[PDB]
């Protein structure tokens, strides 16, 4: 059974980097992609009625149509989505951005680091924590 | 500034185990203790008017007076506390407990292991993630 990670990201290069970094993780992962918060809510809408939710959502803040703050609001307002772990992964390290993400009930916040090496290491640590150390809701 | 961890815990043996595990953790931590959900909310009330919020709150589900689910509800209902990272640390591995913790906007859920080796490791990974890998709200 792969663990399903829903990545919400508008920039193709960030998706490519995530898919390459997940290959190095040594936790069996399947990447789902939404290009903005509107695609993410449509994908989650289908998961309700249909088959499996993602185990984890990673979202960027600055995305067209439905941005990350708007997606966090919508996740926490929907009683069928409120339990989904939602982690911000974004290039902003602005304290005001991190406080607001946490106030909108993001589970965690990760700054995209400044080297490829540190990005690969971040994805290894994200996956070791959320998919190894921590318990997360079952997709069942 | 040490990183301040607020443990909501009445059991002296669990406080001893946490103190012992944090000694071995590579990360400079200061442990604050509240004996139940009601002491925790009073300490946080004083943080508003007075000095610093904790960087992270660790709570169990089964606690006298104000249980963990009720403490999470009270943290998220108070706009001055909603942003505080709150992690359930409990011996329950019931999937319905983990789903409910996440639905009430706990940031994470950690199952207390049954061996000293795995407990020390759990606390090392908790602290490396929340106080190293992740960004959390600043306290000052
Ligand atoms: Ca973006
Ligand atoms: Ca918008
Ligand atoms: Ca939260
Ligand atoms: Ca959440
Ligand atoms: Ca306890």
Numbering used by the authors:
A (entry chain A), B (entry chain B): 7 to 146
What does the paper say about this structure?
A canonical two-component system consists of a homodimeric sensor histidine kinase (HK) and its cognate response regulator (RR). In the phosphotransfer reaction, the phosphate is relayed to a conserved aspartate residue within a receiver (REC) domain of the RR. By pursuing an integrated biochemical and structural strategy, we show that despite close homology, Agp1 acts as a histidine kinase whereas DrBphP functions as a light-activated phosphatase. Our results now settle this long-standing debate and show that DrBphP is a biochemically active protein that dephosphorylates the DrRR, rather than phosphorylating it.
As DrBphP and Agp1 strikingly differed in their enzymatic activity and interactions, we next asked whether these differences could be explained by the structure of the interface between the DHp and RR. To model this interface with confidence, we solved the crystal structure of the response regulator from D. radiodurans (DrRR) at 2.1 Å resolution. The protein, which consists only of a receiver (REC) domain, crystallized in the tetragonal P41212 space group with four monomers in the asymmetric unit. Overall, the structure of the DrRR is highly similar to other reported response regulators. It contains the structural features and the conserved residues critical for its receiver function in two-component signaling. Notably, the crystal structure of DrRR contained Ca2+ instead of Mg2+ ions found in other response regulator structures. The Ca2+ ions played a central role in this crystal form, as their replacement with Mg2+ did not allow crystal formation. Although Ca2+ is chemically similar to Mg2+, its larger size leads to diffuse coordination of the ion in the active sites and 45% higher B-factors compared to Mg2+ ions modeled at the same sites. In each case, the Ca2+ ions are hexagonally coordinated to surrounding atoms, which involve water molecules, the side chains of Glu15, Asp16, Asn17, the phospho-accepting Asp66, and the main-chain oxygen of Asn68. Given its presence in the DrRR crystal structure, we tested the effects of Ca2+ in the DrBphP activity and DrRR binding. We discovered that although the DrBphP/DrRR interaction was slightly stronger in the presence of Ca2+, the DrBphP enzymatic activity was lost.
